[PDB]
Amino acid sequence: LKLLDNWDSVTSTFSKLREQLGPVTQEFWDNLEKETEGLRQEMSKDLEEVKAKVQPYLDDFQKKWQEEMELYRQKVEPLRAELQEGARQKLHELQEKLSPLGEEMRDRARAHVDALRTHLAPYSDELRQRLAARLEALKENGGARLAEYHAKATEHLSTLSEKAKPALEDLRQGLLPVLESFKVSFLSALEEYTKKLN
Amino acid sequence: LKLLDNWDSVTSTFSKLREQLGPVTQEFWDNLEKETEGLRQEMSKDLEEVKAKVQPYLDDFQKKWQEEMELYRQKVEPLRAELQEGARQKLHELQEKLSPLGEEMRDRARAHVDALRTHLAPYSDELRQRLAARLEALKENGGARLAEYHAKATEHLSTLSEKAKPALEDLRQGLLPVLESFKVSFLSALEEYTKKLN
Numbered sequence A, B: 001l002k003l004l005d006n007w008d009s010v011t012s013t014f015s016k017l018r019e020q021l022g023p024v025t026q027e028f029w030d031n032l033e034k035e036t037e038g039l040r041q042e043m044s045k046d047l048e049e050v051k052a053k054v055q056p057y058l059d060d061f062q063k064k065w066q067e068e069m070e071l072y073r074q075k076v077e078p079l080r081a082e083l084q085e086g087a088r089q090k091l092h093e094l095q096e097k098l099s100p101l102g103e104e105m106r107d108r109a110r111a112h113v114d115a116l117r118t119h120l121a122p123y124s125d126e127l128r129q130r131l132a133a134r135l136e137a138l139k140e141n142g143g144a145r146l147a148e149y150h151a152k153a154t155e156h157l158s159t160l161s162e163k164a165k166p167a168l169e170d171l172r173q174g175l176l177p178v179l180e181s182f183k184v185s186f187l188s189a190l191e192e193y194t195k196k197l198n
């Protein structure tokens, strides 16, 4: 009823919008005329001059690129040679800093890893002794704990059920009048709500 | 009242748990103490064993490290000389290259910049010519644009009044009875809600 009237004004609004779109597009397209023509007047010489600018620019850039290429050739090539020789020298350096050092590092390893062998081997063995004692303690105390847990759990399970029995009975006992009372509230609610929603 | 009944059952559980927590923490403290007693008994032993054994361990690694460092320093000396004399040549060759290749690069740069300067000069002026033409077109185009857009704005405002007046009064005209229906429903709905609450 109300929405129907709302739509009426909406229709008029849409109709008036169409009446707007008319002159709007007429002038818009006409605006686009000057827009495209103006841009054409701009871009015509802009593009023609663009070529007349890019031509000498690419020409100048090519020349500069050639100079840079020559620069790179007259630099990178001899530089690579210098760096190659320098690297070769550094390689010789590295060879003297890798061969006598690497072989020494391996000897150091003999006095490190192999030395640690006779250090960690007894250590792990002693660790096993410590582990055995600790594990046995954890087994003695653990077994006792298992019994303790079993006992405490039994005392808990029994009391839990001893409370679950009356709790469940009371819960169900209360649920009866409670659900009924709530049902009464739901029934009245449903009936009252349906009246307002009609 | 239901919240209070439940709360009372929570107080009792928390109290029972606390009363049990007493012997629980006591038994735990006792057990933990016995565990730590052994742990400390073994800790002192382990610590002493580790300390006594760490002596030859650290002593050995100390001697090893000393020899390692001595050889490292005894080698780093000539190695530093290699790097020094090597770098001296590497840098000398680079310096004797940085001068000619640097000056030649600057010479090329002179041409690079010169050719660019003599190009950018007319280029920027030609760009100014473009800007003058572009902005000029934008003046004629923009002038018509703003005028046309303004004209369409006036028409939009006139047709906006065709909404700001009729449609707005229509909206308010609908809002009045709508508010009535809303008041009747919402006001009574609040009553309905309270009916089930309390």
Ligand SMILES: CCCCCCCC/C=C\CCCCCCCC(=O)OC[C@H](COP(=O)(O)OCC[N+](C)(C)C)OC(=O)CCCCCCC/C=C\CCCCCCCC
Pocket: A086, A087, A088, A090, A094
């Ligand atoms: C100064 C003047 C001289 C210039 C020096 C030369 C530099 C330029 C040369 C090479 C650069 C290569 C960079 C590596 C990039 C890839 C990394 C990566 O993706 O790696 C993953 C692979 C996986 O394993 P894979 O079996 O599939 O690959 C090996 C199998 N294949 C080789 C058959 C393909 O792992 C590997 O390649 C791991 C291989 C371990 C590499 C050992 C290096 C041995 C050589 C020298 C010792 C270095 C001393 C350092 C001195 C300091 C200088 C500042």
Ligand SMILES: CCCCCCCC/C=C\CCCCCCCC(=O)OC[C@H](COP(=O)(O)OCC[N+](C)(C)C)OC(=O)CCCCCCC/C=C\CCCCCCCC
Pocket: A138
């Ligand atoms: C499902 C449940 C299972 C649990 C799984 C266990 C996994 C956890 C494992 C590793 C993480 C390490 C964390 C355990 C210890 C943290 C205790 C803690 O929360 O520390 C922080 C509290 C904060 O207080 P504060 O220090 O800032 O204040 C006092 C201020 N005043 C001193 C500074 C001035 O400090 C205190 O509580 C005081 C300090 C207490 C120090 C305890 C460290 C004891 C060390 C070794 C015991 C060995 C155990 C070996 C295990 C094998 C058993 C067979």
Ligand SMILES: CCCCCCCC/C=C\CCCCCCCC(=O)OC[C@H](COP(=O)(O)OCC[N+](C)(C)C)OC(=O)CCCCCCC/C=C\CCCCCCCC
Pocket: none
């Ligand atoms: C205030 C905040 C505190 C929160 C406290 C709440 C705690 C509530 C208590 C326990 C939580 C876990 C309960 C779940 C155990 C079910 C036992 C049961 O009903 O088993 C019979 C089922 C029969 O087969 P089905 O096809 O029906 O089941 C397949 C199940 N479906 C259909 C999903 C595929 O068999 C099975 O599930 C297979 C047997 C699995 C046996 C597991 C024994 C593990 C033992 C020790 C680990 C300790 C866990 C600690 C928790 C308990 C402390 C007392």
Ligand SMILES: CCCCCCCC/C=C\CCCCCCCC(=O)OC[C@H](COP(=O)(O)OCC[N+](C)(C)C)OC(=O)CCCCCCC/C=C\CCCCCCCC
Pocket: none
């Ligand atoms: C009052 C004492 C009650 C004892 C009776 C059994 C009822 C359980 C009761 C309380 C414990 C509560 C917590 C249970 C948690 C998960 C329950 C569940 O849903 O568990 C099945 C799932 C499914 O994975 P799955 O079982 O295929 O993989 C495991 C096998 N895979 C890896 C080893 C080869 O496992 C998981 O969540 C992972 C945990 C699997 C634990 C298995 C332990 C089974 C222990 C005993 C069975 C026989 C009891 C008979 C003797 C007692 C008579 C009173």
Ligand SMILES: CCCCCCCC/C=C\CCCCCCCC(=O)OC[C@H](COP(=O)(O)OCC[N+](C)(C)C)OC(=O)CCCCCCC/C=C\CCCCCCCC
Pocket: B014, B017
């Ligand atoms: C059928 C139904 C099933 C039954 C349900 C079973 C599930 C258990 C459920 C509930 C437990 C009861 C609720 C807790 C009671 C409250 C105790 C208490 O008074 O609470 C508060 C304290 C302090 O808190 P606050 O500083 O903010 O207050 C200070 C106050 N103000 C802010 C004013 C300064 O909180 C504390 O004491 C909390 C300490 C921090 C949390 C520690 C958790 C440790 C858990 C495991 C460790 C494992 C031990 C075993 C393994 C060995 C490891 C070595």
Ligand SMILES: CCCCCCCC/C=C\CCCCCCCC(=O)OC[C@H](COP(=O)(O)OCC[N+](C)(C)C)OC(=O)CCCCCCC/C=C\CCCCCCCC
Pocket: B050
């Ligand atoms: C046989 C003998 C065996 C002995 C070993 C047995 C087991 C270990 C047990 C006990 C030993 C622990 C005690 C020694 C630790 C050092 C504590 C310490 O002296 O403490 C403070 C220092 C300094 O303080 P500062 O340098 O900051 O200040 C600089 C300050 N300015 C410049 C102003 C001056 O700090 C430090 O020594 C920094 C070390 C602590 C920070 C570690 C890094 C933490 C961050 C990230 C962890 C990684 C996460 C990523 C996930 C991993 C995935 C695998």
Ligand SMILES: CCCCCCCC/C=C\CCCCCCCC(=O)OC[C@H](COP(=O)(O)OCC[N+](C)(C)C)OC(=O)CCCCCCC/C=C\CCCCCCCC
Pocket: B148, B149, B150, B152, B153
């Ligand atoms: C053909 C018909 C032609 C006729 C129409 C005429 C053309 C309209 C032309 C021009 C209108 C521009 C007017 C506004 C100019 C002022 C701009 C300005 O000065 O700005 C700055 C102010 C900041 O203030 P402050 O620095 O003092 O404060 C800062 C204080 N604090 C940070 C510290 C705490 O910022 C602000 O005012 C922020 C304002 C943000 C409001 C945006 C509203 C957008 C509207 C609709 C959404 C539609 C998007 C289009 C998509 C359509 C899809 C269908």
Ligand SMILES: CCCCCCCC/C=C\CCCCCCCC(=O)OC[C@H](COP(=O)(O)OCC[N+](C)(C)C)OC(=O)CCCCCCC/C=C\CCCCCCCC
Pocket: B197
């Ligand atoms: C047995 C029965 C049991 C009972 C159970 C109870 C459960 C319900 C529990 C909690 C509900 C939340 C209650 C919030 C109470 C306060 C409401 C209020 O007075 O709040 C307004 C404030 C004002 O804002 P302010 O401080 O920034 O501005 C002023 C800035 N000064 C002061 C600096 C100038 O709000 C703010 O602070 C934050 C803004 C967030 C709210 C925006 C809403 C704006 C209005 C309309 C848009 C939404 C329409 C609804 C569409 C949804 C349909 C589903």
Ligand SMILES: CCCCCCCC/C=C\CCCCCCCC(=O)OC[C@H](COP(=O)(O)OC[C@H](N)C(=O)O)OC(=O)CCCCCCC/C=C\CCCCCCCC
Pocket: A072, A075, A076
């Ligand atoms: C933060 C960044 C730092 C840069 C780090 C670079 C390190 C790279 C690592 C290792 C060396 C790699 C050395 C590579 C040498 C090979 C160069 C070459 O010809 O490359 C060809 C490519 C061609 O790509 P395409 O995509 O066209 O074709 C590939 C194909 N379509 C595909 O999908 O796979 O060209 C390109 O990718 C782009 C053009 C490049 C032109 C060359 C331009 C080089 C010019 C001059 C030399 C370098 C200057 C040295 C200065 C010293 C002088 C003083």
Ligand SMILES: CCCCCCCC/C=C\CCCCCCCC(=O)OC[C@H](COP(=O)(O)OC[C@H](N)C(=O)O)OC(=O)CCCCCCC/C=C\CCCCCCCC
Pocket: A193, A197
């Ligand atoms: C105050 C409120 C009190 C009630 C409160 C209830 C609360 C419940 C609890 C929680 C809120 C739950 C909120 C749930 C929201 C979402 C519910 C939902 O699942 O919606 C989706 C369905 C889906 O329809 P589609 O079936 O066509 O196809 C399924 C879909 N593609 C898919 O993949 O699932 O659409 C439908 O429901 C179509 C139903 C068509 C039946 C006919 C419906 C038409 C019924 C009556 C019309 C009578 C005519 C009246 C006018 C008379 C004059 C002409």
Ligand SMILES: CCCCCCCC/C=C\CCCCCCCC(=O)OC[C@H](COP(=O)(O)OC[C@H](N)C(=O)O)OC(=O)CCCCCCC/C=C\CCCCCCCC
Pocket: none
């Ligand atoms: C069922 C309908 C029945 C019809 C009912 C009609 C009646 C409507 C009644 C009233 C209209 C309200 C008209 C409100 C106009 C603006 C009112 C205004 O300026 O309010 C001020 C607030 C300021 O909040 P602040 O939190 O900033 O508080 C001020 C600040 N703290 C201080 O100290 O100074 O600004 C805001 O919160 C922003 C307002 C956001 C609300 C708009 C939100 C716009 C939401 C949606 C519009 C987008 C539509 C998208 C559709 C897409 C679908 C296809």
